[PDB]
């Protein structure tokens, strides 16, 4: 109930005029008070529409101001252009900043003036520094300045923060006021005519620097921020790569005293094991050279922090490093050109001096792995291989974005990248031809996409036709199925929903063991991903073809084979200005259904082959190998204790034995630590990277102004948990300015805390971080019932596309390819289902979501709605709440810290209850109703849809399942077995878990199966109503946890819930009408 | 390696407790015994492989024939079954008997 005050103060500060008037609007669940609210509304509109003072009425209707619930605030203020400068002149009396063109290697990667690089607008491009975000620089400046103004009179540590951030904002605003502010257009782009006379990279620098200075709480933070903001103004290509590089070595210097272990995907079992750090001497020289480059670039304080730490190498002072490791990724993206970014990859040194003893073993191991993956289904004639075509044709929605192509659905033209739509187009014009796989050669080279991530190189993405997906789908899915239970594949080994996110290194760490970890992200243009890689798979396919008797399977195998033939010679469209280059690239990259598992295979075989050469000079026992994409690690144990020289010699031998296969590598050997893309360990403690740029994005998505605010709050939560903390008030200011909507040129609306923090498709944040909020009140129930009535909307584009002829043809062909003679009973179901996967096409989603937002705004303006009894979650919690009783408890501390970077309250919880050990279906996949869909398809259906489907008669369940590609006999068998009554409970478990973010955010990190949390939860047992006791225990757990988070202390609970209410609620169970947004989830693991 | 007769080595003094600190110096013996306990915890092996913690509890539940979704209530048989406790007990018992 404080957010709205900051909204009011922001409004008062930004507008400031006599003409600027401020108009709240309220609502109440009680009829009489509601009519009094309507009255208040009326009188407010009139008085505003008559230039009368509003401050007078606010007293007469004090009751509405005190007890009713706010929605929004209007604002009447005219243009009043250029007020940003009229505020900013005061914070800019320092000196502006001068670029240095001789810092970056290239010419255009310097922060020089646009006209010095793009005299003509016809060759101008804002794409090398496009923020790609629907929020303005002026927004950011207003927010920063408002924060500075409200914290302009405090005298405490807060003032020590204020002086620091004020100096930083001075550094920024001096540079800005030297020239001026670029003005955003309607599309939030920045045209030539504003940047024509200004530095090209001022905007990205500005946003990143604002984001940093809003994340300064200490002296060392100030040093880091002042040392990057002034250097990120010129260097924009060689900065995050620099400071983020030494970290990989530092982790190899921290002695373990206490460890965490893994067993199964979230299991832990700590160890009091002590392990030293046998680091050789030459890596210190490496680190010294790295710090010398760091100083040579112009860095003084941050080498000093990295230099004074090495005297002790302690893990208590170490989070600074981790903090530093996150301060590198909040400087921005290196959005350079497609060409020069590709040439980071497209440099090749291919030689007729490598072994053949090595490549032949490599090829053979790949062959054998392929056969191990595919022996059983190829032999037992599995349905998904026979009908691989239709399987891929249904799962096209889970594919990559094909090249843009001009379609027409009756009487329109569309430029979709979605491959299902391509298939729909090509079926009509006789072009659908899945057996003829297109070549990829001089006559038809491949486009590209760029996979970026700051502080690293740019990776490339193939953008293929839609035949390759269809061919690869079924076989790669069977390969994944094989890899679910294989230990060595760390991208997949789990129990059907989790990943090995905590790593599996620390089992066999000891004084006798070592571990070699290695980055393998540059190994795409390499000589070992060309011919041998492809030919191994071709050989395996030949074996498998001779290992089957059915013909559909052999056809599928021959198509996957021919795909591998064609990918062996592959050219690449890359523009450079007007003309287009096409380069011979007979190698591997992403943009394929195959790249992930196949790269894991090839890296596994490669390391198995190399690791049998150290054996020529050492005796060791390979304990564990793991491969996950852009890294891989193998642990190995010796007959004796480890020394520095064995580490050195093992590393040199690994490097040279990779060189024998013409393979570059920074070989890294250690005893306690690793560093990889997604995580890293020091001293037996897992850290994470907090590198998510908020005010700058990688590319331009398709969501609205609204949803990006939710995304930004989620990224804030993530980075906070990671360690990188930004001042929350800034985030709230951005959220209000991004949820602000213009009803006219001068009318503008601003929603409130009770619209943005309520569980719906419009949730954006929470009043208290790390805590979803529910509703015990009339009013939250009231607006939630209201908003569910409005979430369901239409898209005319989808309606007209689905009414054309090509859509009908596609449905007809699906049918007669699956089943026939029910053209008006099931086929409509399949068309209705295809509608569910047209919505992936972005303009459809925009039409529908903008419609929802408009419907929301046309009831923020006018009074409120009763919504007609539609049951939701807060309806249930409203009835559960009045039979609780809290009492102060006191739990002790008995669980170990292993994620230091967390906030101290979350850690206090982890330090009092356990960390999670299981994982329940967030997608409802293990449910026996879902194991049919996961057998004949990949499709998700959301747990809302399943939760509804079970509530229906036993008839339409069959139609709904058949519409998802399933046949009729197994659906009939599912209904006859009566397993859905055995599956209501699993579906509801997953539903309730998804609604309340238990597997999304902080609550993903907590053990609710604990004995310690449970002894507080004293709910006696009644029996024969499982849903009620389930929700009761869950809700009580959430109560205890939220009280803990917001107040630290603990409490007990008690609910002697009457049987009458048990039964009254049992029927409200499977009639819930609620829904939560995808954009609101904040996965701690990205 | 073979070591010559030119070589030498010094032997430690491993003569037992001349003081009998287990005779009415309980505050010191508490510290000594705690030190040896925590040292012994650092050498007891971790239980590298077990049976999974959910593939067990369903077998237990069907043996017990329990109401559905009692998993989150943990009918008292099923409380604190996790690993991170089995290793803890295995470690504690041995380290205690040693110290």
């Amino acid at each position: 109930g404080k957010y709205n005050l900051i909204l009011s103060e922001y409004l008062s500060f930004i507008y400031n005029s006599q003409s600027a008037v401020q108009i709240p609007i309220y609502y109440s669940s009680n009829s009489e008070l509601e009519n009094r609210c309507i009255e208040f509304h009326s009188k407010c509109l009139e008085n505003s529409k008559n230039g009368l003072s509003l401050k007078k009425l606010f007293v007469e209707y004090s009751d509405v101001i005190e007890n009713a619930t706010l929605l929004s605030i209007l604002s009447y203020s005219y243009d009043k252009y250029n007020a940003v400068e009229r505020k900013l002149v005061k914070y800019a009396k320092g000196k502006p900043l001068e670029a240095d063109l001789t810092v970056n290697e290239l010419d255009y990667e310097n922060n020089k003036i646009t006209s010095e690089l793009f005299p003509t607008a016809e060759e101008y491009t804002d794409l090398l520094m496009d923020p790609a975000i629907l929020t303005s620089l002026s927004s950011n400046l207003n927010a920063v300045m408002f924060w500075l103004e409200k914290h302009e009179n405090d005298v405490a540590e807060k003032l020590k923060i204020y002086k620091r951030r004020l100096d930083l904002f001075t550094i920024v605003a001096s540079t800005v006021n030297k020239y001026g502010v670029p003005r955003h257009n309607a599309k939030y782009r920045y045209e030539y005519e504003v940047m024509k006379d200004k530095p090209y990279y001022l905007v990205t620098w500005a946003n990143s620097s604002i984001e940093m200075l809003m994340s300064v709480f200490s002296h060392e933070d100030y040093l880091i921020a002042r040392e990057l903001i002034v250097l990120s103004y010129s260097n924009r290509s060689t900065l995050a790569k620099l400071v983020s590089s030494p970290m990989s070595i530092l982790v190899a210097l921290v002695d373990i005293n206490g460890t965490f272990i893994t067993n199964e995907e979230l299991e832990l079992e700590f160890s009091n094991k002590y392990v030293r750090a046998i680091v050789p001497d030459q890596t210190f020289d490496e680190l010294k050279q790295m710090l010398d480059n760091m100083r040579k670039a112009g860095l003084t304080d941050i080498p000093k922090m990295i230099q004074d730490w090495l005297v002790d190498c302690s893990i208590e002072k170490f989070p600074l490093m981790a903090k530093i490791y996150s301060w590198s990724f909040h400087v921005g993206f290196r959005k350079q050109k497609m060409l020069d970014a590709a040439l980071d990859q497209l440099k090749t040194e291919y030689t007729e001096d490598v072994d053949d003893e090595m490549y032949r073993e490599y090829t053979m191991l790949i062959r054998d792995e392929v056969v191990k993956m595919l022996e059983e289904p190829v032999k037992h004639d599995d349905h998904l291989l026979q009908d691989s075509e239709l399987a891929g044709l249904l799962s096209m929605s889970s594919a990559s974005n094909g090249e843009s192509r001009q379609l027409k659905f009756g009487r329109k033209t569309i430029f979709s990248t979605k491959k299902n739509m391509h298939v729909m187009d090509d079926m009509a014009n006789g072009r659908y031809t899945p057996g003829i796989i297109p070549p990829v050669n001089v006559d038809k080279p491949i486009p590209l996409g760029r996979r970026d991530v700051p502080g690293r190189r740019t990776r490339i993405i193939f953008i293929l036709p839609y035949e390759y997906f269809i061919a690869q789908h079924a076989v790669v899915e069977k390969m994944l199925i094989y890899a679910k239970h294989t230990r060595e594949y760390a991208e997949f080994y789990s129990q059907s929903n989790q990943l090995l996110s905590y790593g599996d290194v620390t089992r066999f760490l000891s004084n006798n063991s070592m571990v070699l970890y290695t980055d393998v992200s540059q190994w795409d243009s390499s000589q070992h991903n060309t011919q041998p890689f492809r030919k191994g798979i071709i050989m395996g396919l030949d074996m498998l073809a001779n290992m089957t008797n059915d013909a559909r399977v052999i056809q599928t195998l021959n198509l996957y084979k021919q795909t591998q033939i064609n990918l062996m010679d592959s050219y690449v469209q890359i523009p450079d200005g007007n003309v287009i280059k096409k380069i011979q690239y007979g190698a591997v990259a992403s943009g394929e259904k195959q790249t992930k598992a196949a790269n894991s295979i090839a890296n596994l075989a490669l390391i198995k082959t190399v690791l049998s050469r150290i054996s020529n000079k050492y005796s060791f026992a390979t304990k564990i190998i793991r491969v996950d994409g852009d890294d891989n690690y193998a642990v190995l144990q010796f007959n004796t204790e480890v020394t520095k020289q064995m580490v050195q010699d093992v590393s040199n031998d690994v490097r040279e034995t990779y060189a024998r296969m013409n393979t570059k590598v920074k070989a890294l050997v250690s005893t306690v630590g690793i560093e990889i893309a997604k995580r890293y360990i020091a001293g037996g403690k897992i850290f994470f990277r907090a590198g998510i740029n908020l005010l700058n994005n990688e590319k331009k998505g398709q969501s609205t102004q609204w949803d990006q605010a939710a995304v930004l709050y989620s990224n804030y939560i993530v980075n906070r948990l990671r360690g990188f903390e930004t001042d929350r008030e800034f985030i709230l200011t951005k959220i209000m300015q991004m949820t602000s909507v213009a009803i006219t040129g001068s009318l503008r609306l601003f929603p409130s805390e009770r619209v943005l923090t309520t569980n719906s498709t419009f949730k954006v944040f929470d009043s208290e971080d790390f805590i979803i909020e529910y509703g015990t009140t009339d009013d939250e129930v009231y607006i939630q019932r209201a908003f569910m009535s409005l979430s369901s909307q239409k898209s005319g584009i989808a309606d007209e596309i689905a009414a054309s002829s090509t859509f009908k043809n596609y449905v007809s062909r699906l049918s007669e390819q699956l089943l026939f003679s029910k053209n008006n009973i099931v086929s409509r179901g399949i068309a209705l289902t295809e509608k569910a996967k047209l919505n992936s096409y972005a303009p459809i989603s925009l039409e529908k979501r903008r419609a929802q937002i408009s419907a929301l705004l046309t009831m923020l303006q006018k009074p409120v709605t009763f919504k007609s009894s539609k049951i939701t979650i807060n309806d249930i919690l409203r009835d559960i709440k009045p039979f609780f009783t809290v009492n102060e408890a006191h739990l002790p501390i008995q669980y170990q810290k292993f994620m230091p970077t967390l906030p101290d309250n979350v850690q206090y919880i982890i330090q009092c209850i356990g960390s999670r050990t299981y994982q329940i279906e967030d997608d409802g996949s293990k449910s026996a109703i879902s194991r049919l869909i996961s057998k004949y398809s990949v499709y998700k259906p959301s747990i809302e849809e399943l939760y509804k489907v079970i509530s229906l008669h036993e008839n339409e369940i069959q139609l709904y399942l058949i519409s998802l590609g399933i046949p009729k006999i197994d659906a009939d068998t599912y209904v006859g077995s009566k397993i859905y009554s055995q599956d209501k409970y699993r579906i509801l478990e997953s539903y309730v878990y998804n609604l309340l973010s238990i597997n999304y955010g902080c609550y993903q990190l907590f053990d609710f199966n604990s004995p310690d949390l449970e002894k507080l939860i004293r709910i006696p047992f009644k029996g024969k109503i499982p849903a009620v006791t389930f929700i009761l225990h869950l809700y009580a757990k959430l109560e205890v946890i939220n009280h803990a988070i917001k107040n630290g202390s603990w409490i007990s609970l008690f609910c002697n819930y009457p049987k009458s209410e048990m039964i009254k609620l049992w029927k409200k169970m499977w009639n819930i009408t609620s829904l939560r947004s995808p954009y609101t989830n904040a996965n701690f693991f990205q | 390696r073979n070591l010559p007769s030119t070589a030498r080595y010094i032997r430690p003094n491993l003569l037992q407790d001349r003081l009998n600190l287990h005779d009415n110096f309980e505050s010191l013996w508490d510290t000594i015994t705690t030190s040896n306990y925590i040292l012994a915890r650092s050498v007891v092996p971790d239980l590298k492989e077990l049976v999974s913690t959910e593939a067990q509890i369903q077998k237990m539940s069907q043996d017990l024939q329990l109401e559905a979704l009692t998993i989150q209530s943990e009918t008292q048989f099923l409380t604190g079954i996790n690993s991170q406790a089995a290793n803890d007990c295995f470690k504690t018992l041995i380290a205690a008997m040693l110290s």
């Binding site: 046998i278 001497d281 090495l310 204790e641 | -």
Partner: peptide, 28 residues
């Protein structure tokens, strides 16, 4: 400058001395 740099090289030698290496070195 570089005097302190050589001291940085040096102070990371005396610390963390391993025993097997000095044994084989005494013998060798």
């Amino acid at each position: 400058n570089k005097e302190e740099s050589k001291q940085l090289l040096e102070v990371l030698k005396t610390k963390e001395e391993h025993q097997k290496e000095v044994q084989y070195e005494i013998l060798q």
